[PDB]
Amino acid sequence: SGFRKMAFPSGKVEGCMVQVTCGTTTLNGLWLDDVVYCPRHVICTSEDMFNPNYEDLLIRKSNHNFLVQAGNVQLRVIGHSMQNCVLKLKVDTANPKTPKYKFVRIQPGQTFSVLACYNGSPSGVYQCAMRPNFTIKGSFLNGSAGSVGFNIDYDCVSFCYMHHMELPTGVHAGTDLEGNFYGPFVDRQTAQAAGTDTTITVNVLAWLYAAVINGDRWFLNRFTTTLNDFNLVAMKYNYEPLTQDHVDILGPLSAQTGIAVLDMCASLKELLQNGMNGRTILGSALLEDEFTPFDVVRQCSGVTF
Amino acid sequence: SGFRKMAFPSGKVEGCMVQVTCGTTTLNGLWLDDVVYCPRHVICTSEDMFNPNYEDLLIRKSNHNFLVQAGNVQLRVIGHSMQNCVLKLKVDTANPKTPKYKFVRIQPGQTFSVLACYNGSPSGVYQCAMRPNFTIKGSFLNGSAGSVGFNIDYDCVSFCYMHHMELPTGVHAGTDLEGNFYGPFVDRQTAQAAGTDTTITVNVLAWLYAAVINGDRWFLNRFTTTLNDFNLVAMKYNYEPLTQDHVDILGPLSAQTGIAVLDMCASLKELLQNGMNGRTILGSALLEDEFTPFDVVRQCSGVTF
Amino acid sequence: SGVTFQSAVK
Amino acid sequence: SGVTFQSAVK
């Protein structure tokens, strides 16, 4: 029993984290085989930030301009290139701790673990979701750029986020590991602002299933709703539309608990319209939306890595 | 910016996790140097559980009765003993991944990371606190016994919890790594129930400081309170007494934010008496009590390992 | 009503 | 008002 915000074991990723310094600017990099991946804004002086031309700033650098430190070992950079908003520093040594891995670009609403790092040293691990507006609600200070987000499947680490920057509202923006930003954001000092965010409906439903699995039924009712009618209430409360695909994804959890997806939707509609009346669900007084259906199956059934 | 439930990087502990089997009973163990630590109830058949005599059950076993698997390597047990409620299996091989470590018995209100494991394989990492009633609100299924809780300081892993069992309310009970239970619990199948729990006041205050550090001041006010008067309100709302020692521990956070401890206490008193009026703090609609003062400094200042 | 020891059956 | 790039100064 119990239900926690649960991150993947971070060990496979810890062994990949390094420090990258260029001039007076330092941040973290990701060492896989003989390549170190990091945010390209490492090559930027603060004076370069309002409208950087990175192709220009990079042609002006040499391999020796990049200091890569793996613990207490300097790695020598033997080559460099830009791919989108990430730098790839080729180094003389392959990482002997390179896990089995892939790079994936996730969809909004998907969750991942973040290994927050400073000076190439891991500091903490937490879970978060890619918001519908393509920000993440992370926990990041100066120095944390280059920390990565990931999921683990068996022994394969799927990297899906590299951290770059913090927006004025205190939420976070970054790229996939091939350097493409999530959302409309650019690695320039400019006015940029997240689009208005929405609640991830399919995740809220999954978490209500998690609550049922853990013995909490107070919010259930005997009504059903139609998809169309539920989606009408969703839009009024700033919830993402629920699709037939979402319904299908929630299939396994509906099956385990015997609660039809559309019946759970009637529960959620009541919760949206009436509040919680001083009650909690899995220890929250808010409707939680950063557990995917997969997260719930993973934790209520006990899958390992 | 941001504030997350943040666990320590689990890699140093992942390399210590093994599988221990005795008869038809399996669970996890902790491999440090040439010793494997695990719950002594591994030696129990389900029939042995209402009133086990472990000294008896153990004298009846041989070293070959214990199957220890580290990944895909059988470790040979060359000796065994009981210390309190833990078994220590001496093995022919030292663990080459043994981190620098210590065993510590924590006080109620302290937090730690849990590496939840099944069949010796790490599955997930989360944070939790030792409750005032000496349970933890964990996330554990059958097979998870032997998972450990820990804190990391520089490169030193301080193990403080080994998981044993789940109480009827769905909360969790276990030992320090020397086998002494937290709380009044015993490793017998019997009626056992947690004492009534209380909210960890000093932690709630720390988290209100975290909220101020992250730019949230809506709950502050201009009043001060006396310690004695605050403690009167604490007891009425089922909060732990706040001591002068707690005040002193909150010293650094009071200093960084310029809010006197007793002034923060007046904020908390108002929140207790008036609720939140549909507002949130660091994304919670409840007063959060599983961040210690140290946790807040660690995450709002960016300490690594 | 009872405590559950959270070993597993092999 | 502005984005903060979360490198650090050496």
Curated annotation (Swiss-Prot), chains A, B:
Residues 1-305 are cytoplasmic. There is a cross-link at K5, K90 (Glycyl lysine isopeptide (Lys-Gly) (interchain with G-Cter in ubiquitin)). Residues 1-305 form the Peptidase C30 domain. It catalyses: TSAVLQ-|-SGFRK-NH2 and SGVTFQ-|-GKFKK the two peptides corresponding to the two self-cleavage sites of the SARS 3C-like proteinase are the two most reactive peptide substrates. The enzyme exhibits a strong preference for substrates containing Gln at P1 position and Leu at P2 position. Cleaves the C-terminus of replicase polyprotein at 11 sites. Recognizes substrates containing the core sequence [ILMVF]-Q-|-[SGACN]. Cleaves and inactivates human TRMT1, preventing tRNA guanine(26)-dimethylation of tRNAs. May cleave human NLRP1 in lung epithelial cells, thereby activating the NLRP1 inflammasome pathway. May cleave human GSDMD, triggering alternative GSDME-mediated epithelial cell death upon activation of the NLRP1 inflammasome, which may enhance the release interleukins 1B, 6, 16 and 18. Also able to bind an ADP-ribose-1''-phosphate (ADRP). 3CL-PRO exists as monomer and homodimer. Only the homodimer shows catalytic activity. Interacts with host FBXO22; this interaction promotes the proteasomal degradation of nsp5. This is 3C-like proteinase nsp5. The chain holds residues 3264 to 3568 of 7096 of the full protein.
